[PDB]
Structures are given as structure tokens and as C-alpha cells.
Design a protein around this ligand. Structure first.
Ligand SMILES: [Mg+2]
Ligand SMILES: [Mg+2]
Ligand SMILES: [Mg+2]
Ligand SMILES: [Mg+2]
Ligand SMILES: [Mg+2]
Ligand SMILES: [Mg+2]
Ligand SMILES: [Mg+2]
Lengths: 21, 117, 141
RNA sequence: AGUAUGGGAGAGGAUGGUAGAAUUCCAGGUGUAGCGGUGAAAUGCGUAGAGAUCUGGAGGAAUACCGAUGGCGAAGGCAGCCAUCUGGCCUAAUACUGACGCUGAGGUACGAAAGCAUGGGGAGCAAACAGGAUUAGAUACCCUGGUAGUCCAUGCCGUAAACGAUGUCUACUAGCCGUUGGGGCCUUUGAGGCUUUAGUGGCGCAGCUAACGCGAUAAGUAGACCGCCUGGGGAGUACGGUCGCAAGACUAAAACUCAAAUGAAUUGACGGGGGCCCGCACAAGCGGUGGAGCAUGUGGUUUAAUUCGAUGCAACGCGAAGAAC
């Protein structure tokens, strides 16, 4: 669809941090 | 006519346009219809309203073959994806199976860049 | 309103027949606060209809009114630039209001000597099945 | 601090082979008037036969779920499957040598991406370039094509917000809640529960701090060694020197000018920042304006003057509750 080369690391980490609490 | 009576449906779905194609199980095409034929000619084709119109027009064209057994296969996201189903239900066709056949790439090529505006 | 619901207004029945439907019909016919001329029109139409076939006026009026009543109407609901015409259900008050309005204007389009005579004529025509009021009511469309 | 024995985990590294999905292209079957694209359009493609679908081939790149608060690595970094070679780490105590250790100016090795040289490859994407839109202007954001490059083998370059903006090593100093690899105990009665290590997370006492905050993974209490700083700009710049094919990289000032430049936090204002609420604001109904004739005010033009003010909502039957003198 589009390119995000390394930003999935940021998005996954922040979505995890939100899911923790 | 052919009177095969087992033509499956190929509802191609897209953000900009709606493509409808009904063909036998083997793949030899019988009839097709799109929003462009109706006269929308623009972003109005992207609206879901033309999708059911094109689908029922293709059904009227299929009436000549007298086909009533359908298998609906859809590809791609966007509005108007489900309107064709309601259309082919309203016309009175019978459908054997309903499912999504959208293709997902397993690590395909590099996609284009993101649009800033 | 946004906070509180408003109750409907209560209408006193007409003095002659003590019927609220006739009162609402006269209120719909009345223009510019001239209740007397609308009363005369309605009473003349009712008497002219009664003389053709000797029937109690209020019951005949209700029966010929309910026949032209609609049950559903279309809403303009724009979603993504399309019309999206849709049928809606509405309470009998809204429906009888449109019925009275259609009867009144269809009676007005007719050509006769006075308003009472053309109103009685349209009443009879809509009762028997050839009037324009029933043609105005289209359920399929 | 290190060695030998028996076990464990891991995208650690190098070489080779191999598989699927998807994109593009080449034909073939049926079918065929629009397809593509945008906030709206157009450039572009198509009746030679468009777009969609089915069948068979060619080539290039990456490995969808698993995937995680994961794991490994000195750092940079490492993800399809299998084989060969190889490094480090953890874990139990038995034996062994007996201070064999820490840091480290010069030096040396590794070191994202981009770039350079030689010889191949080139599907998609895409600097430079061309065309169409928008804008007063568009040189750019938007759309349609597209060359270096991105890929492979051998070398050069040695730079990043190369960041935990936190040098390496050692010892001590309340607790609570999760996770990864091991060992021990209790009823492995059941994935269970309790303690000991080696990593990795969230709060928090004392203490520290200008504050934010840190808090056994310290920015606390102490020790050993190295690097680096002395107001802002000039400036990581000139000259010199070393390295490099080049781009350039490293070492590194002064003349001059200013009285400021900064960090954290507080109260307002603003935001083409986000939520909740109210209003004849929307929804429903009735009647008007915008069209015609006339009355009245204003803007423009003319004249000797057409007196002067009021000018988005909040000026325009307004000052004027009344210009023939
Ligand atoms: Mg050393
Ligand atoms: Mg050194
Ligand atoms: Mg640096
Ligand atoms: Mg630094
Ligand atoms: Mg803390
Ligand atoms: Mg220099
Ligand atoms: Mg005035």
C-alpha cells in the first residue's frame, strides 16, 4: 500500500504502551 | 444463447470506480457493466450509488443467458463494495457462496510514497 | 427544541357538529384569519354532498378523508453526494395533515362557480374513485 | 580474573541450495466502450482492440500470519526454509594456576544511509528532467511518464538527533507489580506456589536536582583511569599539515561586533488543535425578499454647488420627530 520503512517500530511500540494500561 | 445458467460474478471494487463482471466458472466472459456507461463521469462514479445500478444492469444483460446461479467474488476496498450484493439480491438472483477473494501480497514490491497533501 | 419536548395544541371542536376533524379542516382552509368564509365554504360543501346522498356528514367526511390518507413519505438524506431517497413512517397527525392539504389544493385547481361547489365536487370524485386527490397520492413513487 | 568436564536459549556472522504470495512484461480463450487519476479536472491509455477474468511462461526485489512488554550482537545492526564452518552468553559444583586485574594519551579494527571506481542485473519505487492543474506569481506541495540510484562481486569514503542527548570498572544503600534464559524447594497432587542468579520494563521511600525529573539498569553514597567545557556570532571558518580518484574528512585560530544568547517552570492571549453544552441556530410549518410599478436611503457619474457625517454582522425609512422662503 505505502512505505513506512522503520516507523512501524514507533507505531507498534506506542500502541503497545497504550495497550499495557 | 449459451443457457449455461452457472455464471459467477466478479465484483471488482476500487476507490475511484466500480467494475462489475459476470462470467461462467471457467472464465469466458459473458457480460460486464461499470459506472462509466451510465454517464456519471467523475467522482460520482466513486459513490456507492452507481455500483448497484451497474450490477443490476449487468443482471438485465445476463437475463438473456437466463443464468440464476451466482458466486460473488470481490476484490479491493472502497465504498460500493457491498452495494452490488444488495443489487443482485434485489434483482432476484440466487447466490451459492459469498466470500471475499481480495489478494494480499506476501512481501511484494516497494509501494509508492505517501501523499503529503 | 433542544431541552424540553413541547406538547401539541388543543383545538376546540366546531359548534355545528362538535367534531375536531371538521375544525382542523376549517383551520387548514382558513386564510388571513378569515374563519367565517372558510366555515361557509365547508358547510356549503358538506350540505351539497349530503343532499346528493342522505348520509350523516361527519362519518362520510371521515371515510372519504381516510381513503386519500398516505402512510409513508420520502426524506432527503445526503450521505456522500447522492440523494438517498428513503421511505419513512410518520404518525397519523402528519399524514392527515398532508391528506387535508392535498384535498384542499386539488379542490382549488378545479373550475366551478364557487369554492364550496368545487370542494363538494372534488369530495364526491375522490369518494367514488375518479378524483384528482387520490391521483395525487402515489405510494409506489 | 581465567582453564577442563556435563547441559540450555537465541533474526549473532560467512558460504551455498531451495519455496510460496504479490507487481510488471510476453502471447492465448471469451468479451469489449470507456479506463486511469483528483478537493475538481487535465496531461496519459483504448475500437490496431481498452479496463475486468481464466490458462501457460520470463525476470527482478522482499519474506504476509507467527511478531511479543520478544531475542542476539561492543556499536552500526540482524526475520521465508535447509545444509557446512564459526564467535559470544547463561547454567550445577568438582578440580586446577594462584593477583595472572581496571583504565588507557599515541595506534589499530569495525562502523546506517548517501556518494565514488571496475564488471554484471534492472520487476517495483524514484533525485535530475518533461507535461497538466492551483496560485497575482509556482520555480514546490497534487497528478501523468521517467534516467542515475536502490540489487550482486571486489575496493574507497569514515560521516548521522551514530541518542538512554547519560564514558569504562568496582562496593553499599526501603518496597510493590510484569516478562525472558537457568537452578533449588514445597503436595510434578494439575500449565501450581515459594526462594537464588543473569537480562529487560512500570510506580515509588531516603537522598540528589534550579526545575522537569533520577531513584539497585541512579542523575544516591564512595574509589581508579581517560575524554571534554569556560558568554553569543564570526566558526567547526581562513592558513598550514595528514588522508582520499573525487566529493571531502581530521587537527584548528584571529581581526571584528554585541550586552546579551540560554534552561526549567508560572499567568494571560492565540491556534486552518481536541471534547461537552446553549440559542427561531439547524429540522417541521406559515408568510416574505430576490422578478414588476412606485416611495425612501446609499454607492457611482454630471454640475456652480449637488453642505457635512454614519460604512461587515454592529452603515444604507441612519443624525433628519417631517429642505418651496
Ligand atoms: Mg583498555
Ligand atoms: Mg584515542
Ligand atoms: Mg559527529
Ligand atoms: Mg554527543
Ligand atoms: Mg522513578
Ligand atoms: Mg574544514
Ligand atoms: Mg439622514
Amino acid at each position: 500500500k505505502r512505505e513506512f520503512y522503520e516507523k512501524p517500530t514507533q507505531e507498534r511500540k506506542r500502541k503497545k504502551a497504550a495497550a499495557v494500561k | 444463447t449459451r443457457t449455461v445458467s452457472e455464471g459467477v460474478a466478479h465484483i471488482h471494487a476500487s476507490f475511484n470506480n466500480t467494475i462489475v463482471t459476470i462470467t461462467d466458472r471457467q472464465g469466458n466472459a459473458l457480460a460486464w457493466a461499470t459506472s462509466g456507461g451510465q454517464g456519471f463521469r467523475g467522482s460520482r462514479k466513486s459513490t456507492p450509488f452507481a455500483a448497484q445500478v451497474a450490477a443490476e444492469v449487468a443482471g438485465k444483460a445476463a437475463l438473456d443467458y437466463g443464468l440464476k446461479n451466482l458466486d460473488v467474488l470481490v476484490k479491493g476496498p472502497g465504498p460500493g463494495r457491498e452495494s452490488a450484493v444488495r443489487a443482485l439480491g434485489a434483482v432476484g438472483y440466487k447466490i451459492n457462496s459469498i466470500t471475499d477473494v481480495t489478494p494480499i501480497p506476501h512481501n511484494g514490491c516497494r509501494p509508492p510514497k505517501k501523499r503529503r497533501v | 427544541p433542544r431541552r424540553r419536548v413541547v406538547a401539541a395544541r388543543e383545538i376546540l371542536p366546531d359548534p355545528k357538529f362538535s367534531s375536531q376533524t371538521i375544525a382542523k379542516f376549517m383551520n387548514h382552509v382558513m386564510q388571513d384569519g378569515k374563519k367565517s368564509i372558510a366555515e361557509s365554504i365547508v358547510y356549503g360543501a358538506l350540505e351539497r354532498v349530503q343532499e346528493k346522498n342522505k348520509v350523516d356528514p361527519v362519518e362520510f367526511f371521515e371515510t372519504t378523508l381516510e381513503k386519500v390518507r398516505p402512510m409513508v413519505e420520502v426524506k432527503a438524506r445526503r450521505v456522500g453526494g447522492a440523494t438517498y431517497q428513503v421511505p419513512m413512517e410518520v404518525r397519523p397527525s402528519r399524514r392527515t395533515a398532508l391528506a387535508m392539504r392535498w384535498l384542499v389544493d386539488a379542490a382549488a385547481k378545479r373550475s366551478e362557480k364557487t369554492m364550496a361547489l368545487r370542494l363538494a365536487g372534488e369530495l364526491l370524485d375522490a369518494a367514488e374513485g375518479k378524483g384528482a386527490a387520490i391521483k395525487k397520492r402515489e405510494d409506489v413513487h
